[PDB]
Structure formats: structure tokens, C-alpha cells
Amino acid sequence: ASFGQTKIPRGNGPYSVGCTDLMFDHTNKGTFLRLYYPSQDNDRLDTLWIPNKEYFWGLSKFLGTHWLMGNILRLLFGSMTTPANWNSPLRPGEKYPLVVFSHGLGAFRTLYSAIGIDLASHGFIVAAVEHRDRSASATYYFKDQSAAEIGDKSWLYLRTLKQEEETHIRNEQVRQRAKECSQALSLILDIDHGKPVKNALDLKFDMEQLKDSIDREKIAVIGHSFGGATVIQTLSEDQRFRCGIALDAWMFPLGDEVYSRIPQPLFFINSEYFQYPANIIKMKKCYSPDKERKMITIRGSVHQNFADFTFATGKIIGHMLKLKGDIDSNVAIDLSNKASLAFLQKHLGLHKDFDQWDCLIEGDDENLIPGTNINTT
Ligand SMILES: *[P@](=O)(OCC)N(C)C
């Protein structure tokens, strides 16, 4: 039945996927997230991928390229869509498991739609947070309630750090990110239990649809690279999250105190080319006989294989810009997504058929490695 439509792949699951944005409150300390969810309507595939010019300006700043690159990126990618139905109604059905997703350094909430849409197509609600810790290439917020209804945006761009700042600011940021993940969860749970919430963005989607929609027993946190460190910090702080999946986690931000505080299952899915010994050693600090830990490495992949820019360009250009690895981008994301589904079934107790991919958790595939290729004897 399935066939190619958008550059970013459609979900492999049985459900069509809707998408909307939620900001509450309006401030630099409020929650900002992009929601993906099972929808009934299948037509539209009309969610704009990068919805504001300032994100392209932010990406240029993050890349350290000349100011005009922002304009060029906007020209190239400003009309790009992702295969989700903008503001489509939530599919009625059984309570849905929930994932809170954390983006990497230089990213923002909309850049992991291949992951969000795949999860939603298999029956998850996914809340992709936008962080206000100055790790996003760009984000926005407002000065007051009137500026929200008026729409005078204040933009906040990635903070570049001096070496002496790395050694404390990254930790401050990961703690803020964990707070933001827990706060996003609380916001979604408030909406689930019927607390009125006023979206600071004016959008068609009525949040009251989400009343009684969440399976409060089946909540996980997933994140890429800074987001992988965020997974670990969040699990250590918030037991409402029952398991975590870290995608090419970047471990540098984390303090030593976190490891002993994570009873929950944790899955590391790594790229072949990003990882390095100092990082792997910190992953190993998470291992203990009393804790469930799994690790796989995707053969021929780079850290950008987890993010949507891996689909944005052709093979040759993508490889040159290190947006693509040697492996095909759909092969890689399918492995990550299927292994994730199996892990989530196992540790959230889902009554689905994702256990068909149990072997992927063990790295048993021609394009996977159990554990790591990195040596640190
Ligand atoms: P990570 O947060 O991945 C970039 C999206 N990192 C390499 C710091």
C-alpha cells in the first residue's frame, strides 16, 4: 500500500499522523513543543518543516557560515514539508503511550520529524520540546500576554562558548533541558486530566481533544546527541519517565552524580562515526548489574543520520556535508526506529507486535553492531 511522497519518510505504522505546536506559558521559561499524534485524516501531509525565517538565520550562525547562508538555506528549504497533517484531529482510541523528545545542539523542535512521525504512526503521542537553554540554533518566546496575542516574537540564538565556559555551562544547560522535559510532561498531563490551557500560539487544534488521551503508565524520554544527555539527566530526576532511549548521546554535559540515580532501562543507539573513547567510557558508567542497559551502533552512520537534514539533500552533497553516512538514510532511521519500538514495547509493556524487532536491540542485523566499534580497553 505504501509509496514515496515526501523527502522525509512517512511513518511505517498503521496510523496517519497529525501535528501541531503548543507554547504555554508565553515566556522564556514556558514550555514550547511540537506534537505528533495518531490522526484519523490521511490526506494532507502539509506540516511545514522549518516554519520561521529566524531558524535559517540561526542555522547559519550555528554553522559559522557567512550571513548570506541563512538566506540561501531559506531559499532551498523554506517550502519543505514533513508527512504529518497540520492541526488534524486526534484519532479516537485507547489511551496512547507518550514520548517526550529532546533535540541536539544547534537543532530545534521540528528537526526530528522522521522519528516523531514514525512513533506517532505506531500509536504514540510525541512531544518534541524546544529548549530555551541557548542550545537551539534559534527559538522564540514573548514578553507578555498581549505580545502573544499580538505576536511580537523575541528570538534567542545559540550561545557559543569559550573553553572555560564549556566546563559549567553545558551542565547548567542539561539541567535546564531536563527541567524542560519534565515541565513539558506536566503540561501534557495537565491537558490530559482536563486543566484548561491557553496556547500562546493561535492554532486550529483544540487541546481539549487530548483530555483522557494519554497512557500515564507508558511514558518515555528519547533524545538525540545533547538530547541523549538530556534523556539521562531527565531519567535521574523524574521517575514518571519509565525508560529512555539516547540517540548518539553526547555525555560531556553530565555530572558524575547521575549514574547511580537511574533505575530505569536505558538504550544507547550510536552512529559509527560520531563516537569517541571519552564518550563511550561515560556511557559505560551507566552500566551496572542491577540496571537494564543496551547499546547498538549503526554501521556506516554519522550523528546527523538521526536528524531530518539527512533527508534534505541528495546522496553526494549529503555525504560531503556529513548529513549522510555510507549507509542509506532510510535504512539507518528504520533500524533506529524499529529497535526503539521493540525497546519501548519491552519496557513500557505495550501490547503490540514491536517484539518482532527484538533482535535489533541486540544489534543482530547486517547493518548493526552489538555494543560499540570504539576501543577503550
Ligand atoms: P549533538 O547535540 O548533535 C548535533 C545535532 N552534538 C554533536 C553536540
From Swiss-Prot:
Outcome of mutating Y157A: Impairs the association with LDL particles
Tissue: Plasma. Secreted by macrophages (at protein level).
Consequence the record notes for mutating V231F: In PAFAD; loss of function; risk factor for coronary arthery disease and stroke
Keyword terms of this UniProt record: Asthma, Disease variant, Glycoprotein, HDL, Hydrolase, LDL, Lipid degradation, Lipid metabolism, Phospholipid degradation, Phospholipid metabolism, Secreted, Signal
Broad class of enzyme this protein falls into: hydrolase
SUPFAM superfamilies named among the record's database cross-references: alpha/beta-Hydrolases
Molecular function in Gene Ontology: 1-alkyl-2-acetylglycerophosphocholine esterase activity; calcium-independent phospholipase A2 activity; hydrolase activity, acting on ester bonds; phospholipid binding
One GO term describing the cellular component: extracellular region
Annotated effect of mutating V331A: Retains the ability to associate with HDL particles
EC number, UniProt record: 3.1.1.47
InterPro entries with a match to the protein in the record: AB_hydrolase_fold, PAF_acetylhydro_eukaryote
Catalytic activity: a 1-O-alkyl-2-acetyl-sn-glycero-3-phosphocholine + H2O = a 1-O-alkyl-sn-glycero-3-phosphocholine + acetate + H(+); 1-O-decyl-2-acetyl-sn-glycero-3-phosphocholine + H2O = 1-O-decyl-sn-glycero-3-phosphocholine + acetate + H(+); 1-O-dodecyl-2-acetyl-sn-glycero-3-phosphocholine + H2O = 1-O-dodecyl-sn-glycero-3-phosphocholine + acetate + H(+); 1-O-tetradecyl-2-acetyl-sn-glycero-3-phosphocholine + H2O = 1-O-tetradecyl-sn-glycero-3-phosphocholine + acetate + H(+)
Pfam families cross-referenced by the UniProt entry: PAF-AH_p_II (PF03403)
Gene3D superfamilies the UniProt entry points to: alpha/beta hydrolase
UniProt-annotated glycosylation sites, renumbered to this chain: N375
KW Transport (keyword) present: no
Result, substituting Q233R: In PAFAD; loss of function
Outcome of swapping D238N: Diminishes activity
Post-translational modification: N-glycosylated. Macrophage-derived PLA2G7 carries sialylated complex-type N-glycans that hinder its binding to HDL particles.
Disorder named in the UniProt entry: Platelet-activating factor acetylhydrolase deficiency: An enzymatic deficiency that results in exacerbated bodily response to inflammatory agents. It can be associated with several disease states including inflammatory gastrointestinal disorders, asthma and atopy. Asthmatic individuals with PAFAD may manifest aggravated respiratory symptoms.
Family, per entry: Belongs to the AB hydrolase superfamily. Lipase family.
Function: Lipoprotein-associated calcium-independent phospholipase A2 involved in phospholipid catabolism during inflammatory and oxidative stress response. At the lipid-aqueous interface, hydrolyzes the ester bond of fatty acyl group attached at sn-2 position of phospholipids (phospholipase A2 activity). Specifically targets phospholipids with a short-chain fatty acyl group at sn-2 position. Can hydrolyze phospholipids with long fatty acyl chains, only if they carry oxidized functional groups.
Name of the protein this chain belongs to: Platelet-activating factor acetylhydrolase
Source species of the chain: Homo sapiens (Human)
Gene: PLA2G7
